[PDB]
Paper text:
Humans have four Y-family polymerases – Polι, Polη, Polκ, and Rev1 – each with a unique DNA damage bypass and fidelity profile. Instead, the active site cleft of Polι is much narrower than in other DNA polymerases, favoring Hoogsteen base pairing.
The Polι1-MeA.dTTP ternary complex (Rfree of 24.9%, Rcryst of 20.5%) was refined to 2.6 Å resolution and contains Polι residues 26–350, 356–371, 378–397 and 403–414, DNA nucleotides 3–11, incoming dTTP, 1 Mg2+ ion, 1 Cl− ion, and 87 water molecules. Clear electron density was visible for both the template 1-MeA and the incoming dTTP in initial Fo-Fc and simulated annealing Fo-Fc omit maps for Polι1-MeA.dTTP. Template 1-MeA is similarly observed in the syn conformation, presenting its Hoogsteen edge for hydrogen bonding with dTTP which remains in the anti conformation. Incoming dTTP is anchored at one end of the dNTP binding cavity by hydrogen bonding interactions between its γ-phosphate and the side chains of Tyr68 and Arg71 from the fingers domain and Lys214 from the palm domain. A single Mg2+ ion (metal B) is coordinated by the triphosphate moiety of dTTP, as well as the active site residues Asp34 and Asp126. In Polι1-MeA.dTTP (and other ternary structures with purine templates), the side chain of Asp126 undergoes an ~30° rotation to establish new interactions with the backbone carbonyl of Leu35, the metal ion at site B, and with the α-phosphate of incoming dNTP. Overall, Polι1-MeA.dTTP is well poised for catalysis with a 3′-OH modeled at the primer terminus located ~3.1 Å from the dTTP α-phosphate and aligned more or less linearly with respect to the scissile Pα-O3′ bond (~162°).
Residue numbers in the entry: 26 to 350, 356 to 371, 378 to 397, 403 to 414
Write the structure that this text describes.
DNA sequence: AGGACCC
DNA sequence: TAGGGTCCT
């Protein structure tokens, strides 16, 4: 059975949130800085050659008038990220988050419901909303085309709601599985949407210039695949199944080979409430294990306010570190009476004991709360 | 714990 | 070269 999936992906999300706070940043090229990294920038800045994730130096050298704002505190972006998801959940309850500014929504049931409500004459006036990938011709007698055009109409409505209710612009992609939705959502940026009819699936997949660009294939699998002389999507498409299982295991092998064909049966899962709460900090160095205790107290402070607000309780805590010049973690359950909520001083002895069990009394420190209930 | 992947 | 997240072995 075919599906209609939508992938919603916001424009320069952190930048966009900062530009709604202080409008004085509109019309100015804008980057959001975290330590020595420009994590994202507005499209005014991408015109000037600034790119996502280039360090501050490279960015000021390329754009000396670039405005930098600090984005080390995710509180505002996180609040907005969930307003967006909750809005999308109004359309269909089953919404899958991916990072802070992407959502998958399975529009299938919605699409069929709207067609059940259309009169025959009304069914030939069905029009696309936005771009059709590869400028492909629509065949109104093709049931799949009709369903994907309705999918595109719902997408437009979503985007219109996010601008009208939260003042946010973004892109959307409508396709038949999650993978295709997310590959097509990027074809026209910013603030536009694109629909992929089936005939054009191979065109879209082959539009990629290397397997790294396929969601599901990262730095490890990519580098592994290169060692086998697989560099294009068609290489992976035509590569030998058996040989691929042996180097990657039947799992990674079969899933990514199907991906290379545009085929993706994975369902849109309901993300619901977060599975974990964490904060972290990086620095030049921290060999003051008494000072590390101060940093840990600061991290833990905010997390308490956040986890409290959620209304569920974590039954496990974790501490994470990174050694000089490759991360390590140590966890433990959370004492039952401690869950009953001065909870700091208790937690600080726990985390420090976890600290010392990991290090003998320094470039990162992180606290995670998981096992929520 | 760690590792892979994602944004 | 940041600050987050998911799920699997
Ligand atoms: C990929 C990535 C994103 N982010 C944050 C910054 C981004 O604003 C936000 C969403 O990431 P993206 O959707 O990848 O990028 P974007 O929305 O900023 O840019 P685009 O307009 O091209 O879609 O998440 C990081 O902090 N680190 C990362 O490595
Ligand atoms: Cl499968
Ligand atoms: Mg985005």
């Amino acid at each position: 059975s075919s599906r209609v999936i939508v992938h919603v992906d916001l424009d320069c999300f952190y930048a966009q949130v900062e530009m709604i706070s202080n409008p004085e940043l509109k019309d100015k090229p804008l980057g959001v800085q975290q330590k020595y990294l420009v994590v994202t920038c507005n499209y005014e800045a991408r015109k000037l050659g600034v790119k996502k994730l280039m360090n501050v130096r490279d960015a000021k050298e390329k754009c000396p008038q670039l405005v930098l704002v600090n984005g080390e505190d995710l509180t505002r972006y996180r609040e907005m990220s969930y307003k967006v998801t909750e809005l999308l959940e109004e359309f269909s309850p089953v919404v899958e988050r991916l990072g802070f500014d992407e959502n998958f929504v399975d529009l299938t049931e919605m699409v069929e419901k709207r067609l059940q409500q259309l009169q025959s004459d009304e069914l030939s006036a069905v029009t696309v909303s936005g771009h059709v990938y590869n400028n492909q011709s629509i065949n109104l007698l093709d049931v799949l085309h009709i369903r994907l055009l309705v999918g595109s109409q719902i997408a437009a409505e979503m985007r219109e709601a996010m601008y009208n209710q939260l003042g946010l612009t973004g892109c959307a992609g409508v396709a038949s599985n999650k993978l295709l939705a997310k590959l097509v959502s990027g074809v026209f940026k910013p603030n536009q949407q694109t629909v992929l009819l089936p005939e054009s699936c191979q065109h879209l997949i082959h539009s990629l210039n290397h397997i790294k660009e396929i969601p599901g294939i990262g730095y490890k699998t990519a580098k592994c695949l290169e060692a086998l002389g697989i560099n294009s999507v068609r290489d992976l498409q035509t590569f030998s199944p058996k040989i691929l299982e042996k180097e990657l295991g039947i799992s990674v092998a079969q899933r990514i080979q199907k991906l290379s064909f545009g085929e993706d049966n994975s369902p849109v899962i309901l993300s619901g409430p977060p599975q974990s709460f964490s904060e972290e900090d990086s620095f030049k160095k921290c060999s003051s294990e008494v000072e590390a205790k101060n940093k840990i107290e600061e991290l833990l402070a905010s997390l308490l306010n956040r986890v409290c607000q959620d209304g569920r309780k974590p039954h496990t805590v974790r501490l994470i570190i990174r050694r000089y010049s490759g991360r390590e973690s140590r966890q433990c359950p959370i004492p039952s009476h401690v869950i009953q909520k001065d909870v700091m001083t208790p937690m600080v002895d726990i985390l420090m004991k976890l600290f010392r069990n990991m290090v003998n009394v320094l470039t990162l420190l992180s606290v995670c709360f998981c096992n929520l209930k």
